[PDB]
Structure 1
Amino acid sequence: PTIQQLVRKGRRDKIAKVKTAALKGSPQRRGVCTRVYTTTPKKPNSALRKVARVKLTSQVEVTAYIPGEGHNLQEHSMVLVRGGRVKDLPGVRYKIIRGSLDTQGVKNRKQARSRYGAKKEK
C-alpha cells in the first residue's frame, strides 16, 4: 500500500490465539479428575487412549491425556496438568504429569523416567 494509507490505517499483526487458556498463564495447574475414562482417536489411528476430565483451579473443566502405560487414577484424584498437544485425540490440548501427589510414576520405566515420574532403582 501507499505510505499515506499506512499512516492512516497502519499495520495490525494477526492476533495470536491464546493457547492453554485453562492454565491462565500458569505452566501447570491442579485439578480434580471429575471423570477418568477412555477415548477413541481419529480415523487412521485406533487405540483406547486414557484421559480425564479435570476441573482445574482456574475454574475450567478440560480434558487431559494420561501418558504412560499404567495409571491409578479414579475420580476425586488431585492431579497436576501441563500442556501438550495430542494429535490423534482432537479435542484435547492438556496432559497430566506424574508426581502430582496422586499420579505415581509409571511402573518399570527405565529409559525416560523423568517424563513419567519414575524414580531410579539402585
Structure 2
Amino acid sequence: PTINQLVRKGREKVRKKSKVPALKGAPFRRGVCTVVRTVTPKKPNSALRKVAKVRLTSGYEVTAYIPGEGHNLQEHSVVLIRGGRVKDLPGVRYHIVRGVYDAAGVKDRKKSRSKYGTKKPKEA
C-alpha cells in the first residue's frame, strides 16, 4: 500500500477473540450441574470421557470436562469451572476443578496431586 494509502487508511489492529467466555475473563467461574453424561472422543480415539453441563454464574450453560480417575458429580452438584480445552471432545472448552465445592478430589492419587485436588497422605 502506497504511503499515501497508509496515511489514508492506515493499518488495522488485530483483536484476538477469547477461547474462554467464563465471562469477566475471570480466573474461574462457578455453577451447578444440569447433566452428568459421558461422551466419545473423536478422529482416532475411543473411550467414554466423562462430562457435565454447567449452569454458570456468568449466566452461561457450558459442557465441562471432569478430569480424574473417577468422580462424584450428580444432577445438582455445585462446582468451580476453570477452563482448558479437550482436544478429543469438540465443544469441551472448560475443565472442572477437582477439590473445590462438591467435586471431590481424586482419591488414591499419588503424583500430580495439586491438580485433582488431593491432600498429601502422610508417610506412615
Q: How does 1:1-122 map to 2 (within 5 A)?
A: 1-122=1-122
Cα shift at 1:50:
0.4
Paired letter, 1:92: V
Taking the aligned partners of 2:8 and 2:19, their CA distance within structure 1 comes to 32
Structure 1, unmatched stretches of 5+, are none
Give the TM-score, by structure 2 length.
0.94
Taking the aligned partners of 2:23 and 2:77, their CA distance within structure 1 comes to 18
Taking the aligned partners of 1:4 and 1:76, their CA distance within structure 2 comes to 62
Paired letter, 2:11: R
Taking the aligned partners of 1:50 and 1:33, their CA distance within structure 2 comes to 13
In 2, are the aligned partners of 1:82 and 1:96 still within 8 Å (CA)?
Answer: yes
In 2, are the aligned partners of 1:98 and 1:104 still within 8 Å (CA)?
Answer: yes
Taking the aligned partners of 1:8 and 1:54, their CA distance within structure 2 comes to 49
In 2, are the aligned partners of 1:22 and 1:62 still within 8 Å (CA)?
Answer: no
Identity, in percent, stands at 74
Hey, which bits of structure 1, 4+ residues long, moved more than 4 A? none
Q: CA RMSD in A?
A: 1.0
Give the TM-score, by structure 1 length.
0.95
Cα shift at 1:26:
0.7
Taking the aligned partners of 1:81 and 1:18, their CA distance within structure 2 comes to 16
In 1, are the aligned partners of 2:22 and 2:28 still within 8 Å (CA)?
Answer: no
In 2, are the aligned partners of 1:97 and 1:116 still within 8 Å (CA)?
Answer: yes
Paired letter, 2:58: S
Taking the aligned partners of 1:42 and 1:24, their CA distance within structure 2 comes to 31
